[PDB]
Design an enzyme around this catalytic site. Sequence first.
Site, PDB file in Angstrom:
ATOM      1  N   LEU A 175       0.841  -1.194   0.000  1.00  0.00           N
ATOM      2  CA  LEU A 175       0.000   0.000   0.000  1.00  0.00           C
ATOM      3  C   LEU A 175       0.876   1.244   0.000  1.00  0.00           C
ATOM      4  O   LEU A 175       0.516   2.240  -0.624  1.00  0.00           O
ATOM      5  CB  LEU A 175      -0.950   0.027   1.206  1.00  0.00           C
ATOM      6  CG  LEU A 175      -2.125  -0.933   1.177  1.00  0.00           C
ATOM      7  CD1 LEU A 175      -2.779  -0.999   2.523  1.00  0.00           C
ATOM      8  CD2 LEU A 175      -3.134  -0.550   0.109  1.00  0.00           C
ATOM      9  N   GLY A 176       2.006   1.172   0.701  1.00  0.00           N
ATOM     10  CA  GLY A 176       2.959   2.265   0.800  1.00  0.00           C
ATOM     11  C   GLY A 176       4.256   1.917   1.503  1.00  0.00           C
ATOM     12  O   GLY A 176       4.289   1.051   2.383  1.00  0.00           O
ATOM     13  N   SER A 177       5.328   2.613   1.106  1.00  0.00           N
ATOM     14  CA  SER A 177       6.682   2.520   1.651  1.00  0.00           C
ATOM     15  C   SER A 177       7.159   3.938   1.982  1.00  0.00           C
ATOM     16  O   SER A 177       6.677   4.903   1.379  1.00  0.00           O
ATOM     17  CB  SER A 177       7.635   1.892   0.636  1.00  0.00           C
ATOM     18  OG  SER A 177       7.247   0.580   0.269  1.00  0.00           O
ATOM     19  N   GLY A 178       8.104   4.042   2.916  1.00  0.00           N
ATOM     20  CA  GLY A 178       8.684   5.308   3.350  1.00  0.00           C
ATOM     21  C   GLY A 178       9.522   5.173   4.601  1.00  0.00           C
ATOM     22  O   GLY A 178       9.890   4.057   4.987  1.00  0.00           O
ATOM     23  N   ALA A 179       9.823   6.321   5.250  1.00  0.00           N
ATOM     24  CA  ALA A 179      10.615   6.399   6.487  1.00  0.00           C
ATOM     25  C   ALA A 179       9.935   5.612   7.597  1.00  0.00           C
ATOM     26  O   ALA A 179      10.612   5.010   8.436  1.00  0.00           O
ATOM     27  CB  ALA A 179      10.781   7.847   6.914  1.00  0.00           C
ATOM     28  N   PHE A 180       8.587   5.588   7.551  1.00  0.00           N
ATOM     29  CA  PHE A 180       7.684   4.895   8.471  1.00  0.00           C
ATOM     30  C   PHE A 180       7.786   3.364   8.370  1.00  0.00           C
ATOM     31  O   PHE A 180       7.362   2.664   9.292  1.00  0.00           O
ATOM     32  CB  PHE A 180       6.234   5.353   8.214  1.00  0.00           C
ATOM     33  CG  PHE A 180       5.686   5.125   6.819  1.00  0.00           C
ATOM     34  CD1 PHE A 180       5.139   3.898   6.458  1.00  0.00           C
ATOM     35  CD2 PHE A 180       5.654   6.159   5.889  1.00  0.00           C
ATOM     36  CE1 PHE A 180       4.601   3.699   5.181  1.00  0.00           C
ATOM     37  CE2 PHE A 180       5.113   5.960   4.614  1.00  0.00           C
ATOM     38  CZ  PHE A 180       4.593   4.732   4.269  1.00  0.00           C
ATOM     39  N   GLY A 181       8.300   2.882   7.236  1.00  0.00           N
ATOM     40  CA  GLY A 181       8.457   1.467   6.920  1.00  0.00           C
ATOM     41  C   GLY A 181       7.693   1.077   5.670  1.00  0.00           C
ATOM     42  O   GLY A 181       7.613   1.862   4.718  1.00  0.00           O
ATOM     43  N   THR A 182       7.142  -0.153   5.658  1.00  0.00           N
ATOM     44  CA  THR A 182       6.336  -0.694   4.555  1.00  0.00           C
ATOM     45  C   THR A 182       5.010  -1.223   5.095  1.00  0.00           C
ATOM     46  O   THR A 182       4.993  -1.999   6.056  1.00  0.00           O
ATOM     47  CB  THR A 182       7.095  -1.743   3.714  1.00  0.00           C
ATOM     48  OG1 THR A 182       7.549  -2.802   4.556  1.00  0.00           O
ATOM     49  CG2 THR A 182       8.264  -1.150   2.932  1.00  0.00           C
ATOM     50  N   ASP A 196       2.857  13.250  17.767  1.00  0.00           N
ATOM     51  CA  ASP A 196       2.999  13.245  16.307  1.00  0.00           C
ATOM     52  C   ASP A 196       1.650  13.358  15.574  1.00  0.00           C
ATOM     53  O   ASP A 196       1.384  12.637  14.609  1.00  0.00           O
ATOM     54  CB  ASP A 196       3.827  12.043  15.795  1.00  0.00           C
ATOM     55  CG  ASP A 196       4.318  12.198  14.357  1.00  0.00           C
ATOM     56  OD1 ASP A 196       4.347  13.350  13.855  1.00  0.00           O
ATOM     57  OD2 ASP A 196       4.622  11.165  13.718  1.00  0.00           O
TER      58      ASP A 196
HETATM   59  C1  LIG Z   1       0.682   3.656   3.987  1.00  0.00           C
HETATM   60  C2  LIG Z   1      -0.545   3.747   4.901  1.00  0.00           C
HETATM   61  C3  LIG Z   1      -0.785   5.192   5.348  1.00  0.00           C
HETATM   62  N1  LIG Z   1      -1.771   3.200   4.289  1.00  0.00           N
HETATM   63  C4  LIG Z   1      -2.205   3.327   2.993  1.00  0.00           C
HETATM   64  N2  LIG Z   1      -3.345   2.721   2.824  1.00  0.00           N
HETATM   65  C5  LIG Z   1      -3.743   2.180   4.005  1.00  0.00           C
HETATM   66  C6  LIG Z   1      -4.850   1.428   4.426  1.00  0.00           C
HETATM   67  N3  LIG Z   1      -4.975   1.053   5.693  1.00  0.00           N
HETATM   68  C7  LIG Z   1      -4.060   1.338   6.622  1.00  0.00           C
HETATM   69  N4  LIG Z   1      -4.264   0.828   7.913  1.00  0.00           N
HETATM   70  C8  LIG Z   1      -3.707   1.276   9.107  1.00  0.00           C
HETATM   71  C9  LIG Z   1      -4.487   1.192  10.271  1.00  0.00           C
HETATM   72  C10 LIG Z   1      -3.932   1.640  11.463  1.00  0.00           C
HETATM   73  N5  LIG Z   1      -2.699   2.145  11.472  1.00  0.00           N
HETATM   74  C11 LIG Z   1      -1.966   2.208  10.358  1.00  0.00           C
HETATM   75  C12 LIG Z   1      -0.614   2.825  10.408  1.00  0.00           C
HETATM   76  C13 LIG Z   1       0.220   3.008  11.534  1.00  0.00           C
HETATM   77  N6  LIG Z   1       1.296   3.642  11.147  1.00  0.00           N
HETATM   78  N7  LIG Z   1       1.187   3.914   9.772  1.00  0.00           N
HETATM   79  S1  LIG Z   1       2.292   4.721   8.807  1.00  0.00           S
HETATM   80  O1  LIG Z   1       3.498   4.637   9.559  1.00  0.00           O
HETATM   81  O2  LIG Z   1       2.166   4.108   7.525  1.00  0.00           O
HETATM   82  C14 LIG Z   1       1.704   6.445   8.738  1.00  0.00           C
HETATM   83  C15 LIG Z   1       2.746   7.548   8.521  1.00  0.00           C
HETATM   84  C16 LIG Z   1       1.774   7.183   7.398  1.00  0.00           C
HETATM   85  C17 LIG Z   1       0.010   3.416   9.348  1.00  0.00           C
HETATM   86  N8  LIG Z   1      -2.457   1.768   9.194  1.00  0.00           N
HETATM   87  C18 LIG Z   1      -2.895   2.023   6.268  1.00  0.00           C
HETATM   88  C19 LIG Z   1      -2.736   2.482   4.960  1.00  0.00           C
END
Ligand SMILES: CC(C)n1cnc2cnc(Nc3ccnc(-c4cnn(S(=O)(=O)C5CC5)c4)n3)cc21
Length: 302
Positions: free
Chosen positions: A22-29, A139
């Site tokens: 769904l996505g990659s970055g500094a936050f991880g994958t 944050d």
């Molecule tokens: C890449 C990310 C933003 N993304 C893209 N489509 C998504 C659909 N569903 C979720 N589901 C959850 C549910 C609860 N927490 C997270 C979560 C926790 N940290 N992050 S992260 O580090 O990717 C945040 C900084 C963008 C996501 N994701 C995350 C999704």
Amino acid sequence: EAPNQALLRILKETEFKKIKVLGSGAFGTVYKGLWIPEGEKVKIPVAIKELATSPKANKEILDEAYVMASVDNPHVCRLLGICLTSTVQLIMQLMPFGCLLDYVREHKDNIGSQYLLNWCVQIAKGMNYLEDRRLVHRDLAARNVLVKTPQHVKITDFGRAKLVPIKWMALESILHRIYTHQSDVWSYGVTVWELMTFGSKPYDGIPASEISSILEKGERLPQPPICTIDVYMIMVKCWMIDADSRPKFRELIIEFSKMARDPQRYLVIQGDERMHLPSPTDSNFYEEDMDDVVDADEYLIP
Ligand SMILES: CC(C)n1cnc2cnc(Nc3ccnc(-c4cnn(S(=O)(=O)C5CC5)c4)n3)cc21
């Protein structure tokens, strides 16, 4: 203080399937997936997060797991479980519309005053819950607000939550590393600014080292064109020097709720009300066998 009796669910690798990234970055994958537990006859759409197997990465993610497993509110993201692979991954609810920041940028031509004001109420509710639970997010940003449906948003990313995003930080945080619920209120103000500008970068072009001096001089983020003095005055109150002079999240719920009852009095958007975003009452709103699919919000356990 009170014992944390939250349950940490260990999920088997065989119980779930990775579909795509769904996505990659500094936050991880972060991966899209399906969780088919035991002999339950349920298919739960999930998001799988992970950052090489480095002991530091496992420590930091298990700290996030701790906080995320300890929260339970409709406007906050809870941890479904963890999978103990070499990497150790977080199993979370799939927010099909991604982060709010990308959503406001990609859907600006269909975002109306009602949607914007309700998001503010929802972020304030989630934030007030974290305050009740004695958690300081540290944050809060539009990138950390995820979209379940255009009418339902939730706060996530508990990787910094305690019991550097300079441009979202309160002045006390930048200068003295002081974090309080009132410093999260400052970050709330900035998040609201990001929404009202349809995803503009705060203090765009200005380097992070300058920010501290700019805020000390009395400079603040500008009034977005759609904002009435009523809405901007709220944002300004979130950015006061004295943390105790900033509104409380419970007051932000009240303020934005009153405004969400007459949205065109508080936000001026050309083409308002005629705008429409997807709903659970839309055609093809919900790739595989949609039989037995249950959202995490409806898949409960004692
Ligand atoms: C890449 C990310 C933003 N993304 C893209 N489509 C998504 C659909 N569903 C979720 N589901 C959850 C549910 C609860 N927490 C997270 C979560 C926790 N940290 N992050 S992260 O580090 O990717 C945040 C900084 C963008 C996501 N994701 C995350 C999704």
